[PDB]
Symmetry: D3
Subunit: 119 residues, 6 copies
DNA sequence: GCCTAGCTACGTAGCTAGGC
DNA sequence: GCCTAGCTACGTAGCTAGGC
DNA sequence: GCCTAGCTACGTAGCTAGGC
DNA sequence: GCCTAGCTACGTAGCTAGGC
DNA sequence: GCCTAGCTACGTAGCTAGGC
DNA sequence: GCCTAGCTACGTAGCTAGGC
């Protein structure tokens, strides 16, 4: 129900966003500063293939309104590795831990979280 | 400390974002849906002139990464009118009341709030 | 077995060259004079529709190697009219009568007959 | 009275078509097939210089309405050689012998003879 | 021996510069000021037709190295009129009288006389 | 009061035309022949620096209305050398000696002197 | 109305394949 | 009026510097 | 009328020859 | 050598005249 | 490295102002 | 080999439809 980023052409149609309990490993970050001309995003998804137990972490970032750059990190069957990478990126960019996201608190000079719409 | 939108060229340098108690009348909204190609913003600011007790509500919206369209509604000394307009726009676009923003809860098909950075 | 001129787009696929006894009403004329820069053709076909007893005379002429101009004269069920038109054109251009074509003799300043190939 | 092909710029004004008894060594061939898109010519002339007893065979061929390609075969004073070349080309292209041209009969897939106009 | 200005296309080949005693009615004036960007000429010729007693005054002026503008004043048989016009132009432009040209003295802000070469 | 040629960009603003008694070492020559298409100038100036006893001879020549070509000959403190060069150029081009310029007489095929305007 | 991605409805340089 | 040097009032190819 | 070879009535890039 | 008028050695848009 | 706003470093059509 | 119809493999002006 949370869609694989359509820009991840290697995995779209072939994989789904990883879910565990209440955790959906899918997040859009955004940092907007009107004075300093900051207006950028960072998407992070932990993807599992539809066909087998094979994980990867997809990251895409850019100036808002651009495709920017991206990176797909292969993790094989190693879920823990993929969760570390996911969680560490989230922490690098927000200074909040992923498991504390219910109490997320924006830090100055780091990205905010943005809740996306799903169909 | 929260800057007047630089796109509001009529008021920038001449006015400040209105503050009262803990209320800063300045908000950035964002709605992003990857499936349906939604990627838009809506900024709302309640502005008070630096020189006198004169209020206006500034609104700017668009596809993210664009200047889009805008509207500056003059409210004279009528603060209540400006607060109504501000609060009603916020409610139209988020389905949350402005005074309940500490407990903001994103509604499907409406905009999320985004916390901006200030200098 | 003698093909309808492919340039006769109104009748091609829908009609055939008219035959009676040994008469095939299909002829290519050519007049070539190297000194006077004459190098032209004149095709005449008497066509009968495949679907019904309906006749027409198709004529196409030009500088050799060009589509030139043409004319399709509708004759309805009147075969005699179509034969007159056919035969009169042949006579105007060769000074030989159509029924004397076995003994055709080229007249100076008139067209020669040219035997085409059929598949 | 039968003109040297004007395209034979080496011999025109300097030579004439060779004649002997009733034989005029000058012929235009044409092959036209509307279905198979054949529409070509082949001219053959046996030329004798005006100044001396010197013969050549001129050949020009092409898509009708084009200059195509050509070949002038020098035969010196050897008339017999020039007659052989002339007659052999005629036979290759029509499957009729030159001396039987009064009874010429078009062969399917070979060229017809065309009588030209002279001034 | 003093040539009619070649730019006087109406009179060149048909007329000569007028002479009387030691007077040759032909003069080139020049005013050059390096500071004020003045660099202009004024030619005056009194012309008599070769064919008859018919006079005109030809004047041509411009920035040096340009054809500039000109004027040909018809004087009929009236020599005196032509001499007045000639002499008055000379005086307007040099502040010297024509008959005093042996003692010519350049006046500041007026043209100098320039002696041309003749063939 | 006689200006340094403005085209002498190395010396203009920094030097003056050399004067001694009644001698101003500054002259414009002009040769105009309407028949032979001669219309050229030659300027000669003997320049002394404003700052010190240092002389040079500046020459500029061309088709009238053009910057043409030029040459600045350095003479150091040697005034005599500069006077020789000046006077010799004048003589080469006019066939009159510089010291006889009060009685200047134009020679056929050599340049005339032209009196310039000063401010 | 605003805007623009991307599509539509052309044009064409020069390749290619078929006649000669 | 003529003429044209050189200036004015644009346009732009592609470099460069700053966000990401 | 149709068509187009080739001609007419231009324009111009840059060479060349003559002044300086 | 410098410079440039004007000439040379092209190219071409579209007119025109002759075949059909 | 990526990208592009906007700037830099030109070129120029045609206006304008000053000589004639 | 020659030639060229017509096709292929582009490019693009500006329309259009969908987000805002
Ligand atoms: Cl074919
Ligand atoms: Cl910036
Ligand atoms: Cl010359
Ligand atoms: Cl013709
Ligand atoms: Cl000026
Ligand atoms: Cl869409």
């Amino acid at each position: 129900k949370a869609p694989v980023d359509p820009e991840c052409t290697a995995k779209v149609g072939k994989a789904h966003v990883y879910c565990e309990g209440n955790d959906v490993y899918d997040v859009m970050l955004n940092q907007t500063n009107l004075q300093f001309n900051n207006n950028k995003y960072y998407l992070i998804q932990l993807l599992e293939d539809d066909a087998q137990r094979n994980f990867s972490v997809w990251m895409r970032w850019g100036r808002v309104g651009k495709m920017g750059q991206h990176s797909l990190v292969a993790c094989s069957g190693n879920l823990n590795k993929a969760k570390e990478i996911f969680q560490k990126k989230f922490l690098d960019k927000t200074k909040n831990n992923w498991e504390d996201r219910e109490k997320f608190e924006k830090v100055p000079g780091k990205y905010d979280m943005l809740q996306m719409d799903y169909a």
